[model samples]
Target chain A: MKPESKEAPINIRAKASQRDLIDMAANLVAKSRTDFMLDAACREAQDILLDQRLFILDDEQYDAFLAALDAPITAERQAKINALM
Target chain B: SKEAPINIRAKASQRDLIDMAANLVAKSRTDFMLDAACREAQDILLDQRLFILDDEQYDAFLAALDAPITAERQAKINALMNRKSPWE
Candidate 1:
């Protein structure tokens, strides 16, 4: 069974020293500064609990993922689809 | 400021060990002792799967048995069998 986690918007600030460390970390990892920062923050958040990391998908893949995740599988939804087949 | 990022790597067998353990942990086992094994396996995978292990840990696992149990650990089997024997 699939379980969904809820999310909320949160704004955060960090010390300049820590931010500088993250900057160097980005360079060391050979990632773009923005991507590294986002990855690090996302990793930290997930470490606390799961933070759903989503990739922005193109139109077809987006629709496909949605269909896989949310294709109605309730008894009725299944029966209706079965009838279509 | 900290240790420089080294190009640490894991061998194929080590990667397999981690993956095998993690897969076992994901199963919903009913037995308590088996659950304990599951937890142990999960911890092993999560603790070391992403990173490379140093020589110490690598040798510790590698310099050993091809089978599951080591010779020293077979004492439990003797005791378990001894219980069912008439002499015990």
Candidate 2:
């Protein structure tokens, strides 16, 4: 793992019950809850951070994503975010 | 923005999911299975969803993806083989 500054800008708090489950996952598994959480978040963080670094904002892809939201249903591409009236 | 999407979470009986994830991570299934678990968790938080692609577009995509080289194209390609590589 690449070294990151131990200092965190955002410190999120989980409920005790959630912590209990996380603790159980840790003791019972190879990774601690924090390790597990960081691993999970870091994967996404890396992508978003990379996009920020790359300055890659594709207008076409964004249009496609948005068009699919408002476009009329074609049987072929019928999966809607929410079923409309 | 505040609403949570309906989700279904479960362990798979099949190995394909782990197999694909392993390929994604450039590791064996054993190595990537744990990473897949973490990825699944992230998806849940982000409300990941799937959408169906148009059959025509999907078919066109699949066809264009890896078509055989045409005779004309193949000749042009073979001609390049004898030429000194730009890298060289």
Candidate 3:
């Protein structure tokens, strides 16, 4: 465990009906309602962002893509890789 | 940025699988693979937590649980439970 760091809080209100559903889900998972909602909101927000984040390529470009991933490790890339580990 | 780039190595066949999947979603192989890995790791970590709610939020959450289920939803739930077990 680490010392608590904090962020500014964001408040969102939902319809009573919506809160009903949300609370049920929160209880089922044994998470605090706010935490559950925050997690869900962030999950959705990131999914939306990543959904739009993409690149395009042709069939030949497909070959290049695989080649890039499978290419032999270079000193530069391996340096970063070791840094990763 | 405090975060440094990470390098990953995969076998030729595994690279092909990742590349094909990346193309399906119009992403570069690296972005696709890293995003997939990070999302999975995040989900696992999030699942392990017991979380907190602010006072007002906690009240609302509790109030909502006391709210009654709709007749339609109750009927739907009953229908689901009434179905024969698949293993039978």
CA error at residue A5 for candidate 1, angstroms: 18
Judging by TM-score against the true structure, name the best candidate: 3
DockQ of every predicted complex: 0.03, 0.02, 0.02
Q: Is candidate 1 or candidate 2 better by TM-score?
A: 2
Candidate 3, A1: how far from true, in Å?
9.3
> What residue pairs are clashing in model 1?
none
* Chain A accuracy of model 2 expressed as TM-score: 0.37
Q: Please report how far candidate 3 places residue A3 from its true position, in Å.
A: 5.6
Candidate 1 is graded, for docking, as incorrect
Best-to-worst ranking by DockQ: 1, 3, 2
Best by lDDT: 3
- The residue-by-residue lDDT of candidate 3 on B1-88, one tens digit each, is 1233333333344444445555666876545544454453345455666658899999999998987998998999999999999896
Task: Give one digit per residue, the lDDT tens place, for model 3 in A1-85.
Answer: 3654334433233344445554566676677655555455444335544642355346676777777789889998899779999
- Misplaced by over 4 Å in model 2 are A1-11, A20-29, A52-54, A59-85, B1-88
User: What would the per-residue lDDT of candidate 1 be over residues A1-85, giving only the tens digit for each residue?
Assistant: 2854343222224344444555555555566544544334333333323312245347777777778588768988778778989
Cα lDDT of model 2 by residue, B1-88, tens digit = 1222212121332233334434544775433434433454544545636535799988988898779999998899889887997899
Q: Model 3 compared with the native: what TM-score?
A: 0.34
